[PDB]
Amino acid sequence: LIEERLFPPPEDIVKNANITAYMKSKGFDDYEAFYRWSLANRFEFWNDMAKELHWFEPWKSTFEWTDKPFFKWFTDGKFNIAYNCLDRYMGTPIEDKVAFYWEGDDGSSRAYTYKEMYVLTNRVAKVLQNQGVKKGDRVAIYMPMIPEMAASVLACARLGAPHMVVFGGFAASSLRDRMNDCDAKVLITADGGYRGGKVIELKKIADEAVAETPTIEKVFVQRHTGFEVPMAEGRDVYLDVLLNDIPEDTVVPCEPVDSEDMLYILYTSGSTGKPKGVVHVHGGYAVGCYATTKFVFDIKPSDVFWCTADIGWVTGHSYTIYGPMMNAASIVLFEGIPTYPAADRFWSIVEKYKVNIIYTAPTAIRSLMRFGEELPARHDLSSLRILGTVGEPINPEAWMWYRKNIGHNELPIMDTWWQTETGMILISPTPILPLKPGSASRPLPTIEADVVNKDGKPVGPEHGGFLIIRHPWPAQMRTIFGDPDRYKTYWETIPDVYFAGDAATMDKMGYFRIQGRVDDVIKVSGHRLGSMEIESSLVSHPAVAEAAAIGKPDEVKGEHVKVFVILRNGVEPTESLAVELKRHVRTLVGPLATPDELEFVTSLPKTRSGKIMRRVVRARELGEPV
Amino acid sequence: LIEERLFPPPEDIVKNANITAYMKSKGFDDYEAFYRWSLANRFEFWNDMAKELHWFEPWKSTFEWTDKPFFKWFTDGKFNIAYNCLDRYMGTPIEDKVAFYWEGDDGSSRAYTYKEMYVLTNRVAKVLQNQGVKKGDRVAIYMPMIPEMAASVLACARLGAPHMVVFGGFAASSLRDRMNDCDAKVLITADGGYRGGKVIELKKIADEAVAETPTIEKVFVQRHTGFEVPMAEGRDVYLDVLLNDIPEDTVVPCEPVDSEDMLYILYTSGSTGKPKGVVHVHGGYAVGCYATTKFVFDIKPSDVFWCTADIGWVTGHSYTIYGPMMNAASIVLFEGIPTYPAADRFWSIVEKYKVNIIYTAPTAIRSLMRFGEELPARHDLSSLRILGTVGEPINPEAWMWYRKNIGHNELPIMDTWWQTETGMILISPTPILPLKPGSASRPLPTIEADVVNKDGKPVGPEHGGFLIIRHPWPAQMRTIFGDPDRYKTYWETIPDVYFAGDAATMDKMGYFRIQGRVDDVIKVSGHRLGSMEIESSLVSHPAVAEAAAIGKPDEVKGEHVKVFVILRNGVEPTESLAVELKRHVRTLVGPLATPDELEFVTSLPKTRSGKIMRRVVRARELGEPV
Amino acid sequence: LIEERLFPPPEDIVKNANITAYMKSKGFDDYEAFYRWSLANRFEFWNDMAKELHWFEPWKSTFEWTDKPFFKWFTDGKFNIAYNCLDRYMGTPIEDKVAFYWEGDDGSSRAYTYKEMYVLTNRVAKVLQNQGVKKGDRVAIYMPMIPEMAASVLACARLGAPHMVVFGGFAASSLRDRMNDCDAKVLITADGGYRGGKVIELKKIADEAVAETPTIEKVFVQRHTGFEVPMAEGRDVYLDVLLNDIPEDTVVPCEPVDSEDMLYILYTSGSTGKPKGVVHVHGGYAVGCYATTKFVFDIKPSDVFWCTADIGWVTGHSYTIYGPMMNAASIVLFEGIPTYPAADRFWSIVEKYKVNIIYTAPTAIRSLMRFGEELPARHDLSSLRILGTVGEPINPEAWMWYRKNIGHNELPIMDTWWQTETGMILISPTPILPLKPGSASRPLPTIEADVVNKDGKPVGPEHGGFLIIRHPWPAQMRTIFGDPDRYKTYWETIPDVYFAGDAATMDKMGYFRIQGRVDDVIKVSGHRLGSMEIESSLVSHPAVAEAAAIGKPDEVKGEHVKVFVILRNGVEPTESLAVELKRHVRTLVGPLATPDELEFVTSLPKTRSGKIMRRVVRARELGEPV
Ligand SMILES: [K+]
Ligand SMILES: [K+]
Ligand SMILES: [K+]
Ligand SMILES: [Mg+2]
Ligand SMILES: [Mg+2]
Ligand SMILES: [Mg+2]
């Protein structure tokens, strides 16, 4: 009943939307006609968008294949994303506007204006530079959500050094593996982060990782907790000590890089394989992140914007730092979690900072729904004008809850669909679209998405199929680091199209619904975890011969991990050992990957080629749909 | 599962049904073949029915259009409905049969035979006549459910004075508006009515209404409560005082009126517009009400019949007074409510009077279901042989409850579909039809109903559409008073057909299901309320600039009213004020229209022509289906 | 969601299955290709199977019609089923293997090896023989589940005396009726049986039955309870007294009978008619029961097998005694019920005897589900490798429960479909088939089942219809005793096919689902009860003029009986009398037939030919689907 219902957009928002302005300026009133035009005129649309940023030198052609299916955008243009996040705002009123409203886990708080971030980024760049960091070099970051994490990212961008950010929830193997796949030259971390009152021993975990990461010349340590931590003489150095000798007036000018020079690497996972280092570049990524933020979140000069995701995920790259700073937004940045001190913390934040736009996980909403409707009702949420969803599809129940309690039965929900590989939002509502619960809606401009069968034949309205994109978009990944074959499979699994890796349905009105990952990859709390990362840390234990991880349904988190373990012969299968192997995974991969269920088994299903058939395992437990 | 199930009719009822007798007499055994015959032979069917009443002079032709789509039935026939309710029973055994078993709110009780009603009606007519009431004049009635309300209606009918009855639940604006649209000459009310132990200040509300109703020469006051009430010298007079000087043997002979002279006006509402004064006439209305009562409720000489609706609605016009008295039924007439003294009150009544046929609101059933299965079980309901439903479609859950507890899993449910405009039941089971829960069933004889799209093309089995009637029927309204354009839209919205205003579905077997009002008019407890009547009383308050009423789902009552108010600038939006504006609507329109929800808003959606788009408002709150 | 899911078979079972071995030996890897081959090559398949048993003399032709639709299998072959259950195991290691693990209601226990059963069966045969029992003679058995019930059945089989077993739950009329329809010559019963701690007065009920069974020359009484019971001098004699004079070395050689000589009669019921004495013969029955047991339950030499059904039903004939003994299985035989001493009793049994295969009623599972997941969890069920279902279709909820708690989310469920008339399982999974919850799956080899309409036209995938078999199978009934017309209707209701009497659906993959009995026969706890047996015992009461039994839904038992009684005129319809008529049915038909609901009514629906229309009765109560 509820999913099949259309919710029209509220008072004043359609007339004043940014997308309506761009539409009007090409002679369109209706999104549908505009959409069709954007398909024909994709290069022109993206030229318009990129013209709105500062370029050091302009580009020869909007798009071209290189050695198909590798490609390029804004060819020969020279650019620095960091410059459109900071430099160009200097000498303007926007220099004194707030860039980050930082909010610590304990309620401490500090606001940084764009000028203050410009200066802080310049000084961090100089510290990196003085160490020998230069264009091309991979800088690893393992940090809590604090200003110096933003400044560190932007400082890498301004040197032309690709950053590689590891979420702070990951433990030592995870951090080590990522740093070695990309041959990282230095590491920026902290003494620790705070999360729900407890200290997270970032530096001690970094120590366990760096000792098996031979490429690391130096570790920069932000002093955040203030706790005595180990500091290896020579390698490890406090950032604040170094910054003592870097004047306030210090300036590292942005390095003008090619529109296709690496901006960053961010590791994500399939259900098989070691993690994939997804590569994004400065030009196309900036333009895509900029345009989608502008249109989807409708950013205006008076807006305070809050995306609740960690910068350790693509969500926070694209829609905390890069995208929103290029619209000159005031951006909330929160160190902590939704439940500490208590489960109204998000609503305190919205109220504290008069937040206008919120973009959050449906995990978070399922989490807070448990604690009832009283908590949001205690706070003034009346500053919100746009809500949003990211990381997975949202059930209609939680959609209603979000709209009812957080949006007073009026506000729009931007239900978004994209992935690390896509770099930017691809399918999503805009303020001008009637909404349907649990629907990403219509594609964004130029994005030629469809639903096809194995062979790439359109399946037609109302039928479930593979969700493909037909033509590149600016912010798409260019490759997988050290491994181009792995990038190619995205284009060569179904002839001539990009294979998103999700199944989907498109209804009579063109609205897409996402039905989850095809590879049945384990997603926990919105995040892809590799079966292989889990299974390895289990086999590395002395007790364990083999392992297979699957994901099983979880009311709150999406799925949780269950693992099936074949022990060595002779080992007694105890609850004590179950607890021990859970501990093992926690201390190596991290809390988010730690199995909630575990079962000792004597055998596992294999191909005759010898690999674990994980689909069979899951189908034994849960059955396979036809 | 449950709706798709056929329940066959019990022991003995099919062979002895009235409809079976009429069928046999035209050579039919099966309702389907008969139905098809009734379409071809509509004029003959209705001639048969009308031949069973007393006519002063007979009619030239069964039917004819006048200035299409106005029309006429039994043309040139002279008739008085009141005569077939009373006069013709005199000098026969039926004069001593009970006509009304009146049952007061407090358990007091009195039975009137047809003779006693003849005499009481004659004497009330004479009082009206002596005042100057004559054929053509509109007599307003605002009364509780007591014998003198029946006698007052019939006395109007016998003078040829159209009655205009305002439900006693309506407050002063509502009563004033109705009296002024029809230019009412006098008012019959009471000092008050009892409802659930509390007094209803009918006379004080009448005083507030008459003071703005310049056409009223006189107010007749039944002394029912006995409480001291204000009586304006000259205008206001006690009925019992006047009746003191009217002998028992007094006789006002029925005025022989044309078969198309006004019987009454009854105001109903759409979602927009001021209330509509629906006009019924003596001849066709009598014949239709007579025939449908005879066939649907199977009335026999031994039957005690009870329709639980107020005479203030069309239900009580057609199927408490006129229809059942023309079958010489013994009729229960109850002043009160289902829950006082307690929630077995209906079942006390059934038992007290050995009621055979009950026709009630599904609101009432949803209401009593809350109080459990013990209450009906305490009483002897074994006298019932036929159950029925009116006012709205009944969910299958409450259908099962009605059949289980009130019908010992045997009795038929006459699930009826019609409206004030149609004057009589149109689609409904008869005793001979297998029943399906939540289905009005097959149309009654001559009634050519179908389901069509905007353009009037049949949509076919199993598909939702507009429910139309193809050809007039005897008891249909002839016009809307003072406003024939408004009557015409019923015929000119879809070419050449009557547009009922409800959506519907017809299954493989011909059974119709009703799916609610198209105009999304607010129905509360089975009753249409105008959005415009509510919204006006709100704007008349000093605090309120504009308002929009919608109906929202309600477990018991069908829907309740929520209103959205734009206040004047500067006015503080308080709970105190919310309470105050609820009070305002209660004291002007009445309890049934009083908003259960209310929301202060700064703006409302409008056409560019300036009107409130109420569909958008509702769709913002509840979404619109595709 | 859940029913539409495929569960693949576990580790090791497919490669080592018996069916895979037979398949490989005809050159097939896939069940589908094999199945199609089995249709063409039915005679060869059954020749292969029968070649695996001992024949006294071989057969001329696998199959032939006699006077169609009577037919025959393994024509002219001479055989004794008892010989393949016992004799041929003597002089081999299997003589010392356990044949029955008997487990009494009170926890007493005794194991019998095949040698010990050979000797016990020989000695019982001799006792019967010495009385004058000879080939052709009907021996009635009314016993609890104890070794001497198995030995008594086998002793009949070895003399060539058809056995007629009456479930011990049946009371005296039921037992008398069955014994008289078949003109039984002797009766083997016991002093009593134990069931849930209480004594069942078998012998006293037998006394009430035999006194109206003129054909009975002798009653053999097993001394099981030890309680003083009445013993009529001359007729009644203790089995143990007679066995005192029968040496241990006594041998009655198996009588070599024709492959079509009667093995047994077992009475089952439709919704109308007196009970039907279904006739099975030695040869085809043995081969079918043997083959289906071998393939479906995958019996290996190390297996302990447990079917929880009483031998009083076809289930225990086919799949406790005959089928499993012909695979040389070790078989549990339990006297009692699932709930005594408590509701873990089945799980104690599985653990006590390291049971490998369990075949049980879904009633039992619905029964035990009520008591929660703790009870099975207390016991070691780890010996189970195959689960199974019999008697009715199992809801998906209880399927999940069975697989989760009894099969640790791995074990297969053999969901079986067949009836007394079919003699053996017909549609069912084998270990090699992916399972779907609530689906019997694909037919067994040679079994040409389909879903057709009234006229026998295939209805096609996904549509509900009549479930027919196209060609006989070895273990099918040959006739109904004393009444061949009644056997013929099975073949002459739809031209040229066997009409199972169940409705069904076949999905895109060939998997059948059963949707219950067409005749709407009353099934209680998996067992067909005749409406006519119930209705008769009610009319035999002095108070009762007429009666009609229907079956109404029951959460646990499938359905329960409700009866509608027309009393004599003048009789007061009391709760006292309701209790009395329930008692009446209990003491004559038995506990399983005793009405849970009863309603006094004044009339019942009849044809004009005068019979009770039971469909109308049910449809008045519960409605009829379209
Ligand atoms: K490398
Ligand atoms: K007027
Ligand atoms: K006989
Ligand atoms: Mg190991
Ligand atoms: Mg005002
Ligand atoms: Mg009798």
Numbering used by the authors:
A (entry chain A), B (entry chain A), C (entry chain A): 14 to 639
The authors write:
The AMP-forming acetyl-CoA synthetase is regulated by lysine acetylation both in bacteria and eukaryotes. AMP-forming acetyl-CoA synthetases catalyse the ATP-dependent formation of acetyl-CoA from acetate and coenzyme A in two half-reactions. In the first half-reaction, acetyl-CoA synthetase activates acetate using ATP to form acetyl-AMP under the release of pyrophosphate PPi (adenylation reaction). In the second half-reaction, the thioester acetyl-CoA is generated from the mixed anhydride acetyl-AMP and CoA releasing AMP (thioesterification/thioester-formation).
Crystal structures of AcsA from Chloroflexota bacterium in the apo form and in complex with acetyl-adenosine-5′-monophosphate (acetyl-AMP) support the flexible C-terminal domain adopting different conformations. Several structures were available for AMP-forming enzymes in their apo states and in complexes with various ligands suggesting that these enzymes can exist in at least three states (apo forms with flexible conformations of the C-terminal domain, CoA/acyl-AMP, AMP/ATP/substrate form). Ligand binding stabilizes the C-terminal domain in the conformations to catalyse the first or second half-reaction, and without ligands, the C-terminal is flexible and can adapt to different conformations. Notably, we found in the apo structure and in the acetyl-AMP-bound AcsA structure of the Chloroflexota bacterium a phosphorylated histidine residue, i.e. His476, in the C-terminal domain. This histidine is not conserved amongst other members of AMP-forming acetyl-CoA synthetases. Although the Chloroflexota bacterium AcsA is a monomer in the crystal structure (supported by PISA server) and analytical SEC supports the monomeric form in solution, we observed in the crystal structure that two trimers (a crystallographic as well as a non-crystallographic trimer) are formed with an app. 500 Å2 buried surface area between neighbouring molecules, with the phospho-His476 close to the threefold rotation axes. Whether this is relevant for a physiologically important process, such as oligomerisation, needs further validation.
